[PDB]
A paper describes a structure:
Herein, we describe the use of GE to optimize a fragment‐derived inhibitor of Mycobacterium tuberculosis pantothenate synthetase, an attractive target for developing new drugs against tuberculosis. Pantothenate synthetase catalyzes the ATP‐dependent formation of an amide bond between pantoate and β‐alanine. The work presented here demonstrates the use of GE analysis to critically and thoroughly examine the binding distribution of a lead compound and illustrates the practicality of applying GE analysis to modify parts of a molecule that are not making efficient contributions to binding. In this case, it led to the generation of a relatively potent and bactericidal inhibitor of M. tuberculosis pantothenate synthetase.
Based on these observations, the initial optimization strategy was focused on replacement of the methyl pyridine and the benzofuran groups rather than the acyl sulfonamide linker in both compounds 5 and 8. Compounds were designed with the objective of optimizing interactions at the P1 or P2 sites of panthothenate synthetase. Consequently, 1‐ethyl‐3‐(3‐dimethylaminopropyl)‐carbodiimide (EDCI)‐mediated coupling reactions were employed to generate a series of indole acyl sulfonamide compounds (10–19; the syntheses are described in the Supporting Information). Compound 10 was the most ligand efficient compound tested. The GE value for the toluene group in 10 is 0.35—a marked improvement over the GE values of 0.17 and 0.16 for the methyl pyridine and benzofuran groups in 5 and 8, respectively. In order to establish this, the structures of the four most potent inhibitors (10–13) bound to the enzyme were solved using protein X‐ray crystallography. The X‐ray crystal structures of 10–13 bound to pantothenate synthetase show binding at the active site, with a conserved binding mode for the indole sulfonamide fragment core. Less obviously, the substituted groups on all four compounds were seen to bind in the P1 pocket of the enzyme. The P1 pocket binds the alkyl groups of the pantoate substrate and is primarily lipophilic, surrounded by the hydrophobic residues Pro 38, Met 40, Val 143, Leu 146 and Phe 157. In contrast, the P2 site binds the phosphates of ATP and is relatively hydrophilic. As can be seen in Figure 2, the binding orientations of the added groups are all similar, and no new hydrogen bonds are formed.
Residue numbers in the entry:
A (entry chain B): 1 to 70, 86 to 288
B (entry chain A): 3 to 291
The structure:
């Protein structure tokens, strides 16, 4: 009946869904705007950019979930950013009845990433929906790196009439443009040097786009063709919702490739002509 | 937020209208109760409404929407009874303050896209021959719950499988609503209320009492064990003219992957002519009875 302990301006950690739910509700009732940054831990500058984006909403309290969908470092990083709530549930707490009711994505989940991994997105949309129901944030923050994921989440939100604002945060990148990812550490020196071709192809495309869609795609393809040991799985230009690219106007160019055993993805905004 | 006149029936079609009114009410302290229906309201629906009105400080939202996504090709969707005039008349007589009557286009502007995939219970019983039926039902109920954000939502027990799956949806997606099951309202002879009873001719209406007679016979027979309970119900169904049984099954109360213990639910579905009737009852086995 009592709200769990919450100390404002400190890092409060909760592993019970009902605790975080009760604290988030208590906080909402006192005025604060609840922001949710979902993560799977092993925090990097990309997650800090989602945190900083959430923190700048006036009156924000920031909830960072850390949950590996089937430590003290992460928490210290959150402490240093001024985050007030970490939600760190067990698999059992998230799934106390096992896998049962789930989210079935629309047919977009079968395209692109959904080729190698036909059910990956059902799993992501299920846990995102649960996290949104537990935390009930006013706004939820994702990076743009996994753009198809982001689009699928906006579809989830629209389709199930969720009241939350979905905020996409521009992808944080290394100095040479490589998109931040937990996988970059695995690249040896030759793979890491080759991997800059994804971001270089996409920026080349976004600039070639004054010359039209084919010039853009041909520019990206040429840059990827200049890289050794980059096995391109797809290179597609779509509209911003990931339907077919309209004759001109706004679009998104997406790429994925395998370098040795590591799969990399990147995407960029494209304006046609 | 549009107009809300209290102590009157306010009808909203736009999801955003009822969402705004609901959230404003909740913030001024009223607890919001949802009774989701497919219209063609009968006294069983009025019992749901009365249950909801009984919650202190309640405001009652009754939704009316014949959801196309739970029907499969065939004439079933076109055939569903629609009596909107009667429906709204009844809600006013019960003192309901909000009816939410959305259009199909306002519910499904993008057609069918993201959906709820129920657990394996949805492929059994009523779902065996209708493999997407319960995905359709839970998808609309999820939407209704997110639009209205009620404190409690009320269902009849007559569609007991559906109520169980709804409890699963609420648990599995950490929804912040209480699910309230209300005991089935019956005609004087025991027949479960249903917007499909209008399709029984006089002979079928007479024979239809067999379902509820079979179930209560089984619940009293149950002191002698599950076989006796099942056999009593089967005997009554067999004695009845023109009743074709589709299934008669005794299950644990969650209908889930656990054997029957002391407490069960006995479920029956049968066709009288073209009309499929359902009914169910609580069963206590042996000492529990
Ligand atoms: C704003 O800049 C960025 C740049 C890259 C990002 C992120 C942000 C976030 C991620 C990432 O995938 N985070 S996550 O594994 O913790 C994650 C996976 C799935 C969901 C729905 C949310 C977060 N990543 C990529 C990654 O870590 O592999
Ligand atoms: C408390 O007493 C009862 C008794 C029977 C009831 C009810 C209440 C409610 C229904 C019913 O089917 N209502 S409904 O078609 O509008 C309906 C269908 C599906 C959902 C999820 C909610 C309501 N029915 C069954 C019916 O009309 O067949
Ligand atoms: C066991 O036999 C069947 C037969 C048809 C089935 C299924 C099973 C399962 C589906 C299915 O999930 N179809 S769907 O993703 O387009 C869908 C999901 C939800 C609803 C309410 C309707 C369709 N469907 C429809 C299909 O694949 O088009």
């Amino acid at each position: 009946m009592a709200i769990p302990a919450f100390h404002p301006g400190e890092l409060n950690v909760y592993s019970a869904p009902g605790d975080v739910a009760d604290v988030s509700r208590a906080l909402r009732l006192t005025g604060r705007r609840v922001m949710l940054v979902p993560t799977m831990g092993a925090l990097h500058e990309g997650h800090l950019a989602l945190v900083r984006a959430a923190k700048r909403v006036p009156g924000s309290v920031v909830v960072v979930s850390i949950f590996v969908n089937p430590p003290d470092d992460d928490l210290a990083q959150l402490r240093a950013e001024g985050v007030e709530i970490a939600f760190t549930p067990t698999t059992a707490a998230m799934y106390p009845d096992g896998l049962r009711t789930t989210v079935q994505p629309g047919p977009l989940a079968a395209e692109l990433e959904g080729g190698p991994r036909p059910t990956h997105f059902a799993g992501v949309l299920t846990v995102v929906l649960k996290l949104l129901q537990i935390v009930r944030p006013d706004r939820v923050f994702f990076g743009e790196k996994d753009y198809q994921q982001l689009v699928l989440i906006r579809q989830l939100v629209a389709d199930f009439n969720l009241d939350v604002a979905v905020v996409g945060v521009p992808t944080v990148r290394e100095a040479d443009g490589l998109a931040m990812s937990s996988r970059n550490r695995y690249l040896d020196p030759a793979q890491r040097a080759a991997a800059v071709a994804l971001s270089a192809a996409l920026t080349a495309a976004a600039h070639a786009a004054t010359a039209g869609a084919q010039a853009a795609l041909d520019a990206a393809r040429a840059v990827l063709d200049a890289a050794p040991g980059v096995a391109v799985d797809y290179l597609e230009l779509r509209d911003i919702g990931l339907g077919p690219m309209p004759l001109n106007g706004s679009g998104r160019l997406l790429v994925a490739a395998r370098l040795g055993t590591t799969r990399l993805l990147d995407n960029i905004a494209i304006e046609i002509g």
